[PDB]
Amino acid sequence: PLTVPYDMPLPGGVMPRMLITIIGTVKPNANSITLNFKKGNDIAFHFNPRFNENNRRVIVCNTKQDNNWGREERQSAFPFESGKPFKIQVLVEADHFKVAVNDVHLLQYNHRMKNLREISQLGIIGDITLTSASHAMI
Numbered sequence: 001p002l003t004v005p006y007d008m009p010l011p012g013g014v015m016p017r018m019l020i021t022i023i024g025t026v027k028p029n030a031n032s033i034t035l036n037f038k039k040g041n042d043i044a045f046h047f048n049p050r051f052n053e054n055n056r057r058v059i060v061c062n063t064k065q066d067n068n069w070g071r072e073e074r075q076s077a078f079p080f081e082s083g084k085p086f087k088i089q090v091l092v093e094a095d096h097f098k099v100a101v102n103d104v105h106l107l108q109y110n111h112r113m114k115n116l117r118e119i120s121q122l123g124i125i126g127d128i129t130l131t132s133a134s135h136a137m138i
């Protein structure tokens with residue numbers, strides 16, 4: 001039984017060819033979801049679907065370094081729905097993270113924090129129920 005917030009440990013951090021698969025369901029009347037690829041107090045990759053930001057559904061991605069957020073990357077393609085099952089897949093490549101939702105490519109996020117093997121945890125928070133959270137080398 002996975003409960004949210006959930007911290008998925010990453011003993012070897014992240015590396016090219018690592019695929020992270022997160023399966024769950026969006027809670028009814030969801031407000032937001034967050035995936036945080038963490039390196040201590042820093043967030044190498046923050047993936048944040050917002051269901052109601054000024055009456056708009058938008059995905060915000062960013063990096064938090066030295067308690068400061070960088071430039072936001074915004075994506076209006078929004079494959080999540082309240083009360084509906086989801087599958088988020090994050091493929092780690094040498095230059096970026098590739099995110100897909102329900103087997104459909106969603107976005108690419110270029111690495112800002114290049115020490116990938118230092119990302120020791122994946123935090124999964126927000127208005128979701130979690131079925132599984134796993135990683136594999138593909």
Ligand SMILES: OC[C@H]1O[C@@H](S[C@@H]2O[C@H](CO)[C@H](O)[C@H](n3cc(-c4cccc(F)c4)nn3)[C@H]2O)[C@H](O)[C@@H](n2cc(-c3cccc(F)c3)nn2)[C@H]1O
Binds near residue numbers: 046053054061069072
């Ligand atoms: O970058 C991502 C960060 O975003 C800020 S919100 C951010 O605030 C900034 C303040 O300067 C700007 O307002 C920024 N913004 C909006 C627009 C804009 C411009 C035009 C139209 C339009 F619509 C919008 N432009 N710039 C906002 O997105 C969240 O707090 C932060 N976060 C939140 C939490 C957090 C929250 C709850 C629980 C928890 F555990 C953690 N943990 N990290 C994280 O998600």
Ligand SMILES: [Br-]
Binds near residue numbers: 123124
């Ligand atoms: Br977190």
